[PDB]
Design an enzyme around this catalytic site. Sequence first.
Site, PDB file in Angstrom:
ATOM      1  N   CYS A 106       0.794  -1.046   0.064  1.00 15.51           N
ATOM      2  CA  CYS A 106      -0.014  -0.173  -0.114  1.00 15.51           C
ATOM      3  C   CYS A 106       0.859   1.237   0.124  1.00 15.51           C
ATOM      4  CB  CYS A 106      -1.017   0.003   1.169  1.00 15.51           C
ATOM      5  SG  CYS A 106      -1.973   1.651   1.306  1.00 15.51           S
ATOM      6  N   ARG A 109      -0.024   4.341   2.948  1.00 15.41           N
ATOM      7  CA  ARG A 109       0.037   4.379   4.199  1.00 15.41           C
ATOM      8  C   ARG A 109       0.473   5.501   5.310  1.00 15.41           C
ATOM      9  NH1 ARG A 109       3.760  -0.708   4.705  1.00 15.41           N
ATOM     10  NH2 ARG A 109       4.399  -0.423   2.398  1.00 15.41           N
ATOM     11  N   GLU A 283      -4.772   4.616 -10.602  1.00 15.23           N
ATOM     12  CA  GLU A 283      -5.672   3.404 -10.595  1.00 15.23           C
ATOM     13  C   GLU A 283      -6.720   3.403 -11.531  1.00 15.23           C
ATOM     14  OE1 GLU A 283      -6.212   1.995  -6.139  1.00 15.23           O
ATOM     15  OE2 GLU A 283      -5.897   4.010  -6.057  1.00 15.23           O
TER      16      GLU A 283
HETATM   17  C1  HEM Z   1      -5.912   6.693   1.964  1.00 13.09           C
HETATM   18  C2  HEM Z   1      -5.415   6.654   0.511  1.00 13.09           C
HETATM   19  C3  HEM Z   1      -5.159   5.179  -0.158  1.00 13.09           C
HETATM   20  C4  HEM Z   1      -4.303   5.343  -1.098  1.00 13.09           C
HETATM   21  C5  HEM Z   1      -4.040   6.336  -2.075  1.00 13.09           C
HETATM   22  C6  HEM Z   1      -4.089   3.609  -1.392  1.00 13.09           C
HETATM   23  C7  HEM Z   1      -3.561   3.275  -2.650  1.00 13.09           C
HETATM   24  C8  HEM Z   1      -3.119   1.864  -2.847  1.00 13.09           C
HETATM   25  C9  HEM Z   1      -2.885   1.210  -4.156  1.00 13.09           C
HETATM   26  C10 HEM Z   1      -2.747   2.011  -5.401  1.00 13.09           C
HETATM   27  C11 HEM Z   1      -2.745  -0.160  -3.820  1.00 13.09           C
HETATM   28  C12 HEM Z   1      -2.320  -1.179  -4.775  1.00 13.09           C
HETATM   29  C13 HEM Z   1      -3.457  -2.118  -5.130  1.00 13.09           C
HETATM   30  C14 HEM Z   1      -4.083  -2.266  -6.526  1.00 13.09           C
HETATM   31  O1  HEM Z   1      -3.326  -1.043  -7.241  1.00 13.09           O
HETATM   32  O2  HEM Z   1      -4.902  -2.810  -6.705  1.00 13.09           O
HETATM   33  C15 HEM Z   1      -3.003  -0.449  -2.404  1.00 13.09           C
HETATM   34  C16 HEM Z   1      -3.036  -1.491  -1.868  1.00 13.09           C
HETATM   35  C17 HEM Z   1      -3.480  -1.765  -0.465  1.00 13.09           C
HETATM   36  N1  HEM Z   1      -3.987  -1.015   0.240  1.00 13.09           N
HETATM   37 FE1  HEM Z   1      -4.044   1.230   0.250  1.00 13.09          FE
HETATM   38  N2  HEM Z   1      -4.822   3.133  -0.391  1.00 13.09           N
HETATM   39  C18 HEM Z   1      -5.084   3.735   0.697  1.00 13.09           C
HETATM   40  C19 HEM Z   1      -5.801   3.392   1.635  1.00 13.09           C
HETATM   41  C20 HEM Z   1      -5.932   2.373   2.219  1.00 13.09           C
HETATM   42  C21 HEM Z   1      -6.580   2.126   3.399  1.00 13.09           C
HETATM   43  C22 HEM Z   1      -7.557   2.703   4.306  1.00 13.09           C
HETATM   44  C23 HEM Z   1      -6.422   0.909   3.705  1.00 13.09           C
HETATM   45  C24 HEM Z   1      -7.067  -0.141   4.903  1.00 13.09           C
HETATM   46  C25 HEM Z   1      -7.534   0.371   5.889  1.00 13.09           C
HETATM   47  C26 HEM Z   1      -5.524   0.173   2.737  1.00 13.09           C
HETATM   48  C27 HEM Z   1      -4.839  -1.139   2.684  1.00 13.09           C
HETATM   49  C28 HEM Z   1      -4.654  -1.644   1.628  1.00 13.09           C
HETATM   50  C29 HEM Z   1      -4.054  -2.971   1.258  1.00 13.09           C
HETATM   51  C30 HEM Z   1      -4.147  -4.184   2.410  1.00 13.09           C
HETATM   52  C31 HEM Z   1      -3.420  -3.112   0.047  1.00 13.09           C
HETATM   53  C32 HEM Z   1      -2.841  -4.316  -0.734  1.00 13.09           C
HETATM   54  C33 HEM Z   1      -3.783  -5.301  -0.883  1.00 13.09           C
HETATM   55  C34 HEM Z   1      -3.137  -6.715  -1.414  1.00 13.09           C
HETATM   56  O3  HEM Z   1      -2.400  -7.385  -0.625  1.00 13.09           O
HETATM   57  O4  HEM Z   1      -3.293  -6.713  -2.543  1.00 13.09           O
HETATM   58  N3  HEM Z   1      -5.150   1.458   1.800  1.00 13.09           N
HETATM   59  N4  HEM Z   1      -3.475   0.695  -1.970  1.00 13.09           N
HETATM   60  C1  LIG Z   2      -5.607  -6.894  -7.180  1.00 13.64           C
HETATM   61  N1  LIG Z   2      -5.029  -7.363  -5.957  1.00 13.64           N
HETATM   62  C2  LIG Z   2      -6.300  -7.541  -4.830  1.00 13.64           C
HETATM   63  C3  LIG Z   2      -7.123  -6.062  -5.095  1.00 13.64           C
HETATM   64  C4  LIG Z   2      -7.688  -5.985  -3.429  1.00 13.64           C
HETATM   65  C5  LIG Z   2      -7.230  -4.573  -3.142  1.00 13.64           C
HETATM   66  C6  LIG Z   2      -6.926  -4.263  -1.908  1.00 13.64           C
HETATM   67  C7  LIG Z   2      -6.450  -2.997  -1.528  1.00 13.64           C
HETATM   68  C8  LIG Z   2      -6.410  -1.912  -2.211  1.00 13.64           C
HETATM   69  C9  LIG Z   2      -7.006  -2.247  -3.671  1.00 13.64           C
HETATM   70  C10 LIG Z   2      -6.910  -1.098  -4.632  1.00 13.64           C
HETATM   71  C11 LIG Z   2      -8.288  -0.298  -4.531  1.00 13.64           C
HETATM   72  C12 LIG Z   2      -8.027   0.905  -3.480  1.00 13.64           C
HETATM   73  C13 LIG Z   2      -8.553   0.485  -2.129  1.00 13.64           C
HETATM   74  C14 LIG Z   2      -8.393   1.641  -1.282  1.00 13.64           C
HETATM   75  C15 LIG Z   2      -8.966   1.459   0.245  1.00 13.64           C
HETATM   76  C16 LIG Z   2      -7.811   2.788  -1.748  1.00 13.64           C
HETATM   77  C17 LIG Z   2      -7.407   2.740  -2.849  1.00 13.64           C
HETATM   78  N2  LIG Z   2      -6.448   4.178  -3.146  1.00 13.64           N
HETATM   79  N3  LIG Z   2      -7.325   1.925  -3.879  1.00 13.64           N
HETATM   80  C18 LIG Z   2      -7.167  -3.521  -4.147  1.00 13.64           C
END
Ligand code: HEM
Ligand SMILES: CNCCCc1cccc(CCc2cc(C)cc(N)n2)c1
Lengths: 407, 411
Positions: A106, A109, A283
């Site tokens: 992520c 964070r 995204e």
């Molecule tokens: C606040 C702005 C946030 C941004 C800009 C953000 C951005 C991202 C991005 C770009 C990804 C890559 C996954 C993808 O592209 O499909 C990601 C993954 C992830 N985000 Fe964040 N996110 C945010 C908030 C959060 C929050 C609030 C949570 C949980 C409370 C969270 C938990 C996660 C987790 C667990 C993953 C990876 C999941 C996996 O294992 O594939 N994110 N995030």
């Molecule tokens: C494709 N890998 C599994 C997708 C599940 C997933 C988990 C966490 C984030 C995302 C991307 C969507 C997302 C979620 C949140 C909370 C924020 C963000 N910027 N974008 C996908």
Amino acid sequence: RFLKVKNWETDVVLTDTLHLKSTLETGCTEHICMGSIMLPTKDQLFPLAKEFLDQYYSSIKRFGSKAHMDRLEEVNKEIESTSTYQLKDTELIYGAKHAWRNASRCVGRIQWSKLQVFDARDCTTAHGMFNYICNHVKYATNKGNLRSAITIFPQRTDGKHDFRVWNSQLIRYAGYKQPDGSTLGDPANVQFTEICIQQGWKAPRGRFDVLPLLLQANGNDPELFQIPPELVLEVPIRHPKFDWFKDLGLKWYGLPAVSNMLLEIGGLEFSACPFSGWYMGTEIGVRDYCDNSRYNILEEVAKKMDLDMRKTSSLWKDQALVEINIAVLYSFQSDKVTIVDHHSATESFIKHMENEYRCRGGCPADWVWIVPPMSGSITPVFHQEMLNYRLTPSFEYQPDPWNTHVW
Amino acid sequence: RFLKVKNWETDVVLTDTLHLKSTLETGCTEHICMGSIMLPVRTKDQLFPLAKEFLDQYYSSIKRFGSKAHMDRLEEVNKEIESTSTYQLKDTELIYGAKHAWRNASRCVGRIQWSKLQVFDARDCTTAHGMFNYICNHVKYATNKGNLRSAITIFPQRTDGKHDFRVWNSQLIRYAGYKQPDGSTLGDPANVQFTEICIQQGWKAPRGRFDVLPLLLQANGNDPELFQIPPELVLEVPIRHPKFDWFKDLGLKWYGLPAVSNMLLEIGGLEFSACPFSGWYMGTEIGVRDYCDNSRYNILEEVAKKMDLDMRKTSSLWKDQALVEINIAVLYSFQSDKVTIVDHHSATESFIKHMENEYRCRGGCPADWVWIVPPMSGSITPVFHQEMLNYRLTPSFEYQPDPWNTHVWKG
Ligand code: HEM
Ligand SMILES: CNCCCc1cccc(CCc2cc(C)cc(N)n2)c1
Ligand code: HEM
Ligand SMILES: CNCCCc1cccc(CCc2cc(C)cc(N)n2)c1
Ligand SMILES: C[C@H](O)[C@H](O)[C@H]1CNc2nc(N)[nH]c(=O)c2N1
Ligand SMILES: C[C@H](O)[C@H](O)[C@H]1CNc2nc(N)[nH]c(=O)c2N1
Ligand SMILES: [Zn+2]
């Protein structure tokens, strides 16, 4: 054993000590690295609880206090007696904020500590779940001034009474296969869109139809609910220079809300825990719009720009991709909906790493997922060495429910 | 044990068994991934197993495993090892070795070409002047008036580690870089340290923005010597844009031949510390990295200025926009001058086909995602959506420390 990571753009070196507290496994061995693979009882549970409570009480500076010892004993007794236990509100919030903190993929964070936790552990029915989710959506959306949140439904018990949200996100567009062969709307959601109709949804067969919610409470059959449209903030996509853009008919939703993950805290499994934040622009623009297995609009945008699409080496795909992403950010910003660009987000993440290395001894990070899917090397994370390891509390993947549900 | 990788764009699944034959380590453990870490004197004791393993592979590939030829060779090498503490490869073996080292290069996107490698055997070389001559011939052969051909030149192997051949240059052709007293850099910032060494060794630096460095060559563990590649042998390309007439006025050029010379070729336990090798460029190497890395030529500002982009808010994506034009220019200039170059779409598509082919005919293809994915436009190339297994096979190319850090000077 006390590891170093170098930034190759700035020579900055950080020492990682936090990885030694790593509990779970990575998929990799000394013989093979799996860094790019998408998804590699009572006695079990007490150590898990203790590890958690130890870090909880250490975080509040009461490590080895009466409070700590008492609580440790209290839970110990509860497990021996109940074959599980319940988290104090304070632990629940700590755990969730930390599951986010430990999410190595992520980029967002830096915001980890400012998470709103909605405790939904008293929920019993799917109608109740719906209420909780609408409340979450309305709160998080906040008229476009987005706020991070998670809503936590009851924990798994005997695995027969599981709470699950069947959607992958609270808000996604439907996907239907056309008789003409191609796909209408979002291909990623074709199967789910089926299981909706296959459960009773009346699909408007449009391009951007917000899917209904499919909520499962206490292991029961899942139920359908339509999110009130007035709660679903959407953004029509226009370009700040190309007036023909609008006529592509593109829009996207403001609130990204992942709902199919499993939150693990001190051994406990919360299988329904939708969480939301706000989008990084790529995204939607790069992945949602331009992926071949998604809305795949590149060819059409490029046509409209009158680009030499004859040879790949004119870089017409690249040229369009940039414009598309300028438009996504443009639209969102105009309509005052929170969005972040990949440049700003990655820069914030580097700062966040600095802080984590400095005040926590490290920060697990998965380079493959942190580096944005466009302009990779002109963002600072590209040149940033990262160590990937698994810390708990954590968010984990789980099987899609339809494959699992004892119907 | 079988292992599967999936392409998430096409759902095509492949199964790796090649990873079983993996000898060296990765740097990863069950508890940590070092997949994005950049960099993660040998006795007769450990040598013969390495030789035997090599010779076994070699004889399998020519369909003579277990033949008398195979067995005599093993006997011959065995005897020579204990006799002399090392051994010499036949030419056929040197060639097979070098090709396969390329074939095993998990960070290399251009591996589809691996079987077409011109190998120049320079094992009879004794002096730095001899090295200069061999390298000049390499550069001329590989360049081929712009119609580039892959080549490697292989100098004598390490013996006691005190008599190493080394090419001090990181690439045969590279631009000088000069730190100014005001802290600014003239030319290529990546090459400042190396440029200073050359100047110290007696090089007279013209001190411009695109000065081709001299070759600094070490033979038989002696002190390195300076040599100037004949300019007529160094092909260069003025960079211009197909639409922006002001682009040429930016005064940019690049050389046509990418030729890496600081790596170590390991074949059957033998260590070749000087083995310069070359192919042709993928456009983004110059366009994205060489020109736009902050710590390189860093021309994004000035290109964006001239485009009059909104450089105030980064969400204007002016950086992305300039980056594309710059990469458009690099490819246009090269194709225009008829110097071989490949765009990242073409290169990644070919690597996917190569990869699939390697699974079917070899049982795997070790690949390093972090390095295979292009530094712009990642996800609209097919490698982005491709799961890959990284592991290390021999023969291989390995890093080695810069020789100015290890050299024992004679004076
Ligand atoms: C606040 C702005 C946030 C941004 C800009 C953000 C951005 C991202 C991005 C770009 C990804 C890559 C996954 C993808 O592209 O499909 C990601 C993954 C992830 N985000 Fe964040 N996110 C945010 C908030 C959060 C929050 C609030 C949570 C949980 C409370 C969270 C938990 C996660 C987790 C667990 C993953 C990876 C999941 C996996 O294992 O594939 N994110 N995030
Ligand atoms: C494709 N890998 C599994 C997708 C599940 C997933 C988990 C966490 C984030 C995302 C991307 C969507 C997302 C979620 C949140 C909370 C924020 C963000 N910027 N974008 C996908
Ligand atoms: C013929 C066209 C070729 C192309 C387009 C190509 C492309 C590339 C690129 C883009 C990289 C990434 C390195 C970086 O970005 O700094 C790379 C790495 C590499 N290439 Fe190739 N290459 C080619 C030929 C060769 C040849 C002929 C050899 C050796 C005989 C070779 C061996 C390697 C090795 C060993 C690496 C990884 C080095 C490391 O560990 O960092 N390549 N290649
Ligand atoms: C400090 N080590 C510098 C050399 C690292 C390196 C090894 C192999 C390839 C590269 C990229 C340059 C290159 C070389 C070749 C033969 C082809 C190509 N397209 N690009 C760099
Ligand atoms: C730290 C990180 O691994 C480093 O910046 C890598 C990332 N991927 C790369 N990929 C290529 N092709 N070339 C590089 O120099 C790098 N640098
Ligand atoms: C196979 C590879 O792991 C897969 O394409 C990954 C690569 N990196 C990614 N990075 C992000 N942020 N999101 C993704 O979906 C993916 N997909
Ligand atoms: Zn790994």
